[PDB]
Design a protein around this ligand. Sequence first.
Ligand SMILES: Nc1ncnc2c1ncn2[C@@H]1O[C@H](CSCC[C@H](N)C(=O)O)[C@@H](O)[C@H]1O
Lengths: 128, 416, 17, 166
Amino acid sequence: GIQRDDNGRRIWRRRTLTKKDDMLRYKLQRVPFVEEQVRKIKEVGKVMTMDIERLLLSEDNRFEFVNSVAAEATEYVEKNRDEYGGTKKAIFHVLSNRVNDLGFDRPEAYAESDPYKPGPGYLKEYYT
Amino acid sequence: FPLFQLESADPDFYKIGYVRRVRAYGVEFKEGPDGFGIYASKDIEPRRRARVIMEIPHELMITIRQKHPWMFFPDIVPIGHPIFDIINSTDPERDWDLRLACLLLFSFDREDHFWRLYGDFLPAADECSSLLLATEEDLAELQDPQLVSTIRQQQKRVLEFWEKNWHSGVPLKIKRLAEDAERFIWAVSIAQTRCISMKTRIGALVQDLNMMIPYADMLNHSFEPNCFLHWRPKDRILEVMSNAGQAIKKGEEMTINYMPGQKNNMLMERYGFSTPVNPWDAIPFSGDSRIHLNSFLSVFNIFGLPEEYYHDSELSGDDSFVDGAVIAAARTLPTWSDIDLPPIPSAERKAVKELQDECRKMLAEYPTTSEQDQKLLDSLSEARTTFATAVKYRMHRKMFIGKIIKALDIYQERLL
Amino acid sequence: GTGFNKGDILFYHREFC
Amino acid sequence: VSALERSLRLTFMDELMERARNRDPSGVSEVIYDMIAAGLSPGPRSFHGLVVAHALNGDEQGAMHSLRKELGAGQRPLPETMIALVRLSGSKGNAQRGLELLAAMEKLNYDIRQAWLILVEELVRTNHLEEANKVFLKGARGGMRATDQLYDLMIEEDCKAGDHSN
Ligand SMILES: Nc1ncnc2c1ncn2[C@@H]1O[C@H](CSCC[C@H](N)C(=O)O)[C@@H](O)[C@H]1O
């Protein structure tokens, strides 16, 4: 398989699919009208539900997972008490860190606010 | 301001995996003259835990039970197929590769099987480095009669199996699996060079399996790897995990340990390659001249128990000299130890001189040298892969002996 | 459930210089 | 480093190691003072020889004094010196001195697992099961892993002593 073309460069055969896979053309297509859906999913916090399901795919026992998460959150609160309880929750921080430890980027503790609040004092009125 | 200021693999290779729930994170497939490899497309930052690199679903593998009886997961062989009769007649202990070769041929003949597509990225007969494809000329350059005898016996066994099970009267569905012997030989070579054995739990069943795993056999071997394989049973996924807390930079190759504690001869026999920094290589000394193990370890900063020798890499600072070769030397040099008894330097000088004499005798026993072997490799233009593999094997052995000599020299120098 | 299975040398000894 | 200095160091080190292997710390100190007179600076090897000479004939105070001399000389002690000191402390049953030596070894960027194993094994050997258990548990809670033989030894000895808690 070794062959040099007289100039020091080694010529080698590139590997190619050389076959038809009908699953390629039919599957690599994107829906164009899910901007509001994705934004609403991020706003309500379903990405954290997906993260929680993902973390349990590597756990033999879910009760052990819950106990370990609670212990880690307790350590977080004991070390830095003042940083939690408001916009940052310890359990959410633990979940985000465990997701981030896998190499998947997430906002810290899933802490988000509304950029459209019309100044201080105004509270969003939920539409039931 | 922005205005003032190895080749990438075939995209279809990852695309066919990607459309079937194969996910590679932070790594890209690159192809070079040596072969396929996996490299970090960016800087893999070190986290608290192991990071997920690859995810290969179970349904894309070709796995067989490692112990009798033979059950395949997922079950691709239909009931009553003669390929099961061919598989079931093999020797349970040593004929594991034959069963995987039969499964590979059967899958290659299956129209809806994934490996009919992934099989186009396996190395061909002229690209595979396995010694089952080596001729008598290539084996003559191993400079090791034992390895040559082992390779000849393996080739004989493979050819005997093919002749026994692929005679004239076999049905057409079997004859088309391997029309001629070299096809089955290539199948066995691929099985030997790419098989992964593991203990996997599927549902409630825990068992050992011999597995042909796509996108994970592309990882290259290392005795100091940055990645390891972890089976996830809940969703039946094989994970490639980078070591926890080990930073990996852009372009750094992702490697796993194919088999720990195996010398270069076993690596050549199984995967058809060898490495110069094998920390388990052995050189047969007479044992009459011995040095102090503790001083040798302390000079080169080799810590841990005899089965976990490891270079600290901190006190050395920039000493590239200390590597797996020094560890192998410490594991193979004749040594003595008396708890806290210090060594007298004068005896160490004589011992290292005698050991260097033995090493130079061994180097002289070889017809050629290592530098001339490297020059032959550089000037090589019309040789098979196994030819260069044998040349590199003997060159690596010579390099290991030379490294032992230099290590003894610097050890006797630094003893004061 | 979650309750199952019970849930100084080298100092004061530096080189004088 | 000329050949003359190398030969002088070879002769002095050979004599020092010969005296150290003969359990003669005073002779080792004589050779060290000869090195000082001759201009040869005592490296960590010479102080290691002195420490070994003191430790071989069960002399913990002199060994610690030799370590203090090595530290005051500005030299970095070898791992062998530290493991010899921890083994001496374990043989004498001085668990706290062994822990201090382990802390010093950790501070000097050294692997303390082997020395921890040596210390606990020596404490077991000299019938100091309480201190052996204490040091073993300190190391185990610290993340260190012991050998299978040491695990079995600790379990069996503790259960023979009637100590189910440890
Ligand atoms: N560290 C290494 N150095 C040289 N060859 C290696 C190697 N690790 C693995 N290999 C080779 O790679 C094969 C394993 S499959 C790995 C990918 C392969 N090179 C390809 O392009 O398809 C083995 O047959 C072995 O010969």
